[PDB]
Enzyme design. Structure first.
Site, PDB file in Angstrom:
ATOM      1  N   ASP B  25     -19.498 -30.828 -39.191  1.00  0.00           N
ATOM      2  CA  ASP B  25     -19.104 -31.273 -37.846  1.00  0.00           C
ATOM      3  C   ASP B  25     -17.603 -31.071 -37.655  1.00  0.00           C
ATOM      4  OD1 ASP B  25     -18.702 -32.336 -35.437  1.00  0.00           O
ATOM      5  OD2 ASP B  25     -19.627 -34.267 -35.875  1.00  0.00           O
ATOM      6  N   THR B  26     -17.217 -29.927 -37.104  1.00  0.00           N
ATOM      7  CA  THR B  26     -15.783 -29.635 -36.898  1.00  0.00           C
ATOM      8  C   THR B  26     -15.152 -30.593 -35.884  1.00  0.00           C
ATOM      9  OG1 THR B  26     -16.251 -27.952 -35.277  1.00  0.00           O
ATOM     10  CG2 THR B  26     -16.079 -27.230 -37.572  1.00  0.00           C
ATOM     11  N   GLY B  27     -15.906 -31.279 -35.046  1.00  0.00           N
ATOM     12  CA  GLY B  27     -15.352 -32.261 -34.122  1.00  0.00           C
ATOM     13  C   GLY B  27     -15.126 -33.627 -34.752  1.00  0.00           C
TER      14      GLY B  27
HETATM   15  C1  LIG Z   1     -21.494 -37.607 -33.722  1.00  0.00           C
HETATM   16  C2  LIG Z   1     -22.120 -36.234 -33.550  1.00  0.00           C
HETATM   17  C3  LIG Z   1     -23.500 -36.128 -34.170  1.00  0.00           C
HETATM   18  C4  LIG Z   1     -22.247 -35.900 -32.085  1.00  0.00           C
HETATM   19  N1  LIG Z   1     -20.951 -35.848 -31.419  1.00  0.00           N
HETATM   20  C5  LIG Z   1     -20.054 -34.729 -31.741  1.00  0.00           C
HETATM   21  C6  LIG Z   1     -18.989 -35.097 -32.756  1.00  0.00           C
HETATM   22  O1  LIG Z   1     -18.337 -33.884 -33.181  1.00  0.00           O
HETATM   23  C7  LIG Z   1     -17.905 -36.050 -32.238  1.00  0.00           C
HETATM   24  C8  LIG Z   1     -16.910 -35.367 -31.281  1.00  0.00           C
HETATM   25  C9  LIG Z   1     -15.870 -36.346 -30.810  1.00  0.00           C
HETATM   26  C10 LIG Z   1     -14.556 -36.261 -31.236  1.00  0.00           C
HETATM   27  C11 LIG Z   1     -13.657 -37.233 -30.859  1.00  0.00           C
HETATM   28  F1  LIG Z   1     -12.353 -37.123 -31.243  1.00  0.00           F
HETATM   29  C12 LIG Z   1     -14.006 -38.306 -30.083  1.00  0.00           C
HETATM   30  C13 LIG Z   1     -15.323 -38.379 -29.712  1.00  0.00           C
HETATM   31  F2  LIG Z   1     -15.726 -39.419 -28.944  1.00  0.00           F
HETATM   32  C14 LIG Z   1     -16.264 -37.441 -30.065  1.00  0.00           C
HETATM   33  N2  LIG Z   1     -17.166 -36.630 -33.354  1.00  0.00           N
HETATM   34  C15 LIG Z   1     -17.026 -37.940 -33.510  1.00  0.00           C
HETATM   35  O2  LIG Z   1     -17.510 -38.814 -32.825  1.00  0.00           O
HETATM   36  O3  LIG Z   1     -16.205 -38.187 -34.559  1.00  0.00           O
HETATM   37  C16 LIG Z   1     -15.788 -39.562 -34.648  1.00  0.00           C
HETATM   38  C17 LIG Z   1     -15.931 -40.087 -36.073  1.00  0.00           C
HETATM   39  C18 LIG Z   1     -15.549 -39.037 -37.096  1.00  0.00           C
HETATM   40  O4  LIG Z   1     -14.194 -39.183 -37.511  1.00  0.00           O
HETATM   41  C19 LIG Z   1     -13.285 -39.421 -36.469  1.00  0.00           C
HETATM   42  O5  LIG Z   1     -13.142 -38.198 -35.742  1.00  0.00           O
HETATM   43  C20 LIG Z   1     -13.453 -38.431 -34.354  1.00  0.00           C
HETATM   44  C21 LIG Z   1     -14.303 -39.689 -34.317  1.00  0.00           C
HETATM   45  C22 LIG Z   1     -13.713 -40.522 -35.473  1.00  0.00           C
HETATM   46  C23 LIG Z   1     -14.943 -41.248 -36.007  1.00  0.00           C
HETATM   47  S1  LIG Z   1     -20.986 -36.419 -29.909  1.00  0.00           S
HETATM   48  O6  LIG Z   1     -19.660 -36.365 -29.401  1.00  0.00           O
HETATM   49  O7  LIG Z   1     -21.665 -37.668 -30.027  1.00  0.00           O
HETATM   50  C24 LIG Z   1     -22.038 -35.342 -28.965  1.00  0.00           C
HETATM   51  C25 LIG Z   1     -21.498 -34.227 -28.326  1.00  0.00           C
HETATM   52  C26 LIG Z   1     -22.290 -33.383 -27.587  1.00  0.00           C
HETATM   53  C27 LIG Z   1     -23.657 -33.646 -27.497  1.00  0.00           C
HETATM   54  N3  LIG Z   1     -24.588 -32.862 -26.818  1.00  0.00           N
HETATM   55  C28 LIG Z   1     -25.799 -33.353 -26.969  1.00  0.00           C
HETATM   56  N4  LIG Z   1     -26.901 -32.746 -26.481  1.00  0.00           N
HETATM   57  C29 LIG Z   1     -27.990 -33.483 -25.869  1.00  0.00           C
HETATM   58  C30 LIG Z   1     -28.844 -34.318 -26.755  1.00  0.00           C
HETATM   59  C31 LIG Z   1     -29.379 -33.050 -26.183  1.00  0.00           C
HETATM   60  S2  LIG Z   1     -25.919 -34.843 -27.889  1.00  0.00           S
HETATM   61  C32 LIG Z   1     -24.200 -34.751 -28.165  1.00  0.00           C
HETATM   62  C33 LIG Z   1     -23.393 -35.615 -28.882  1.00  0.00           C
END
Ligand SMILES: CC(C)CN(C[C@@H](O)[C@H](Cc1cc(F)cc(F)c1)NC(=O)O[C@H]1[C@H]2CO[C@H]3OC[C@@H]1[C@H]3C2)S(=O)(=O)c1ccc2nc(NC3CC3)sc2c1
Ligand SMILES: [Cl-]
Lengths: 99, 99
Positions: B25-27
């Site tokens: 998960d690069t995000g």
């Molecule tokens: C959790 C993943 C499984 C899903 N996500 C992507 C992650 O990459 C997020 C990206 C992100 C970065 C941030 F900076 C702030 C954020 F709010 C979000 N990462 C994250 O939350 O990271 C967290 C944790 C990791 O460590 C730290 O870094 C940042 C923070 C912090 C604590 S998503 O966003 O929920 C997502 C996106 C599109 C989407 N499209 C969909 N399709 C439909 C169903 C059909 S479902 C779906 C879900």
């Protein structure tokens, strides 16, 4: 380009004549942007992240430039802590993960 | 390996003698797993996703195998809809995004 992951993988986007930054996010199926005006009709959608859900606007066949590449795809507009480019648009760039 | 992004980038992990799957998960700055027992002391931590926040347990210097590669690093344990491997561990694999 090739990028390492010591920093957040942030790229410049142009959408609806608006310039923004967004994170190339392999953990995102769909693309979610907060700060944007798009013209025309949209569909309600509920998406689920860490810590719960948000209500977004689904906009279809939106033109968007990601690090110079023009693609057309679905964009979700709604509250996100970070603009995220999902696999729906990164596949159009031929993006790969390497290790 | 190299992987495209038409599918979710899911890999096999081994942690605390427990086998699981997780998204590369690069995000994600940090690594977040739900379905796990880890030994010893940990710190409260609040993290923010789409749809808000979750309380997690921070475990430090946890041994974890990601698609064969033994690394040690910080693991966050808590409610996540998907186990995610963050950049904290992907940098230890020398992972890159290419397009
Ligand atoms: C959790 C993943 C499984 C899903 N996500 C992507 C992650 O990459 C997020 C990206 C992100 C970065 C941030 F900076 C702030 C954020 F709010 C979000 N990462 C994250 O939350 O990271 C967290 C944790 C990791 O460590 C730290 O870094 C940042 C923070 C912090 C604590 S998503 O966003 O929920 C997502 C996106 C599109 C989407 N499209 C969909 N399709 C439909 C169903 C059909 S479902 C779906 C879900
Ligand atoms: Cl794939």
């Amino acid at each position: 380009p090739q990028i390492t992951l010591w920093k957040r993988p942030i790229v410049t986007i142009k959408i609806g004549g608006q310039l923004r930054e967004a994170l190339l996010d392999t953990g995102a199926d769909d693309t979610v942007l907060e700060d944007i005006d798009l013209p025309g009709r949209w569909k309600p959608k509920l998406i689920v992240g860490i810590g719960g859900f948000v209500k977004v606007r689904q906009y279809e066949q939106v033109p968007i430039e990601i690090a110079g590449h023009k693609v057309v795809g679905t964009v979700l507009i709604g509250p996100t802590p970070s603009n995220i480019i999902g696999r729906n648009l990164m596949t159009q760039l031929g993006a790969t993960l390497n290790f």
